[model samples]
Target: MQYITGLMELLLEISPELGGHSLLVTQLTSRLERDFNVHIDLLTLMENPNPRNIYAHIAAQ
Candidate 1:
């Protein structure tokens, strides 16, 4: 396992009741890393990810 699922659960908790587009993936990732004192290595999957934040927001409802 690559060390997620738990962070996935955290993201689920952080997801706003309105939708979940209120945060940038980068900022959210940073939130988890800094606030929780943990690093999410799954970011490797997003190498060279964004210039315009195309993958920034979440559309979860």
Candidate 2:
């Protein structure tokens, strides 16, 4: 929820041209989950959206 939005906002601020390609998103989240134990998935993204919210949730955890 907030995690996803927070991440997106931070990235976009750094580079407005940034876009979340499927592979990149998968790769990034996979690593994050593996290393940080932050769970994220395409299904959740599609359903809940708001990248920052997802990121926030993970960080909150």
Candidate 3:
């Protein structure tokens, strides 16, 4: 989607959980890349959430 003014405001209006999910995903991915030499392509991964990937990452914690 194209950028728009207060764009996130509009998005959060639809899915309040998105804000928290986005934040948590960013934190999780950052930690993984920093400590485990793994990089998550958030944009692509989010488009297709693989349960295995998510579970494995979570289990790493």
Local distance difference test, per candidate? Answer: 0.38, 0.53, 0.43
Residues 1-61, model 2: lDDT tens digits: 3444456566556533135646566455445554445765655545544455656655755
Better of 2 and 3 by TM-score: 2
TM-score of the candidate numbered 1? 0.25
Judging by TM-score against the true structure, name the best candidate: 2
Q: Give the higher-TM-score candidate: 1 or 2.
A: 2
C-alpha root-mean-square deviation, candidate 3: 10.5
- The TM-scores, one per candidate, come to 0.25, 0.34, 0.26
**Ranking of all predicted structures according to lDDT, beginning with the best and ending with the worst:** 2, 3, 1
Query: Can you write out model 1's per-residue Cα lDDT over 1-61, one digit (the tens) per residue?
Result: 1123345446566532122333464456545543443333445325424322322322110
In model 1, residue pairs whose N, Cα or C atoms come closer than 3 Å (at least 3 residues apart or on different chains), thus clashing, are none
What overall lDDT, based on C-alpha atoms, would model 1 receive against the true structure? 0.38
**In candidate 3, where is summed lDDT lowest over 10 consecutive residues?**
1-10
How do the residues 1-61 of candidate 3 rate in per-residue lDDT, one tens digit apiece?
1121134445455532224346554454444443544444555346434445544654554
Model 3 ranges off by over 4 Å = 1-26, 53-61
